[PDB]
Write a protein that binds this ligand. Structure first.
Ligand SMILES: O=P(O)(O)O[C@@H]1[C@@H](OP(=O)(O)O)[C@@H](OP(=O)(O)O)[C@@H](OP(=O)(O)OP(=O)(O)O)[C@H](OP(=O)(O)O)[C@H]1OP(=O)(O)O
Ligand SMILES: [Mg+2]
Length: 158
């Protein structure tokens, strides 16, 4: 729908999501992408014009995409999808300047329940991963900005 909300500055699509952690904080909940069937990501989605805050969007998408209920325990701030040839400064190399694709507002959630039936339960897989596994999945998914969000969480990395 054209019910989506965009940054008035950069025109980046405004998305909220959840780093959903087990109470012991040893594992994060990950879902498969709908387009890229084999790629493991975290629950997230576009803010809608009616929604009063990012927490609403985040908890709605965590239910819809992952059948996961929990309490938001931290605001993990923002990360950007910086995807659209190169510009070399002679001490480093960078991609040619462009506006961000997406601006993500992430929250840490403590999982309280996982339900077997949820809206996207037939079009996605869903599973708990240790930090090391989760980190490798996000690299495999080519989503370093989601890994940045994961890294700000209280997930045990040792
Ligand atoms: O192509 P990507 O990787 O940039 O991401 C995809 C993202 O998929 P992802 O790869 O993040 O898993 C899709 O979401 P999905 O995972 O639910 O299929 C999402 O579709 P959407 O309109 O439902 O938007 P959300 O991703 O719930 O905010 C967007 O897809 P669309 O091309 O079908 O409209 C998004 O695309 P962008 O506009 O580029 O952000
Ligand atoms: Mg999504």
């Amino acid at each position: 729908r054209e019910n989506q909300v965009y940054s008035p500055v950069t025109g980046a699509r405004l998305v909220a999501g959840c780093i959903c952690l087990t109470p012991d904080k040893k594992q994060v909940l990950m879902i498969t992408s709908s387009a890229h069937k084999k790629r493991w990501i975290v629950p997230k989605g576009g803010v809608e014009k009616d929604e009063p805050n990012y927490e609403t969007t985040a908890q709605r998408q965590t239910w819809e995409e992952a059948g996961c209920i929990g309490k938001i325990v931290a605001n993990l701030g923002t990360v950007e999808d910086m995807r659209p040839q190169f510009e070399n400064s002679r001490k480093d190399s960078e991609v040619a300047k462009h506006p961000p694709r997406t601006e993500f507002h992430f929250y840490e959630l403590e999982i309280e329940n996982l339900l077997d039936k949820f809206p996207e339960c037939h079009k996605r897989h869903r599973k708990l991963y240790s930090y090391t596994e989760a980190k490798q999945n996000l690299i495999d998914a080519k989503r370093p900005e989601l890994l940045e969000a994961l890294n700000r969480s209280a997930i045990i990395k040792d």
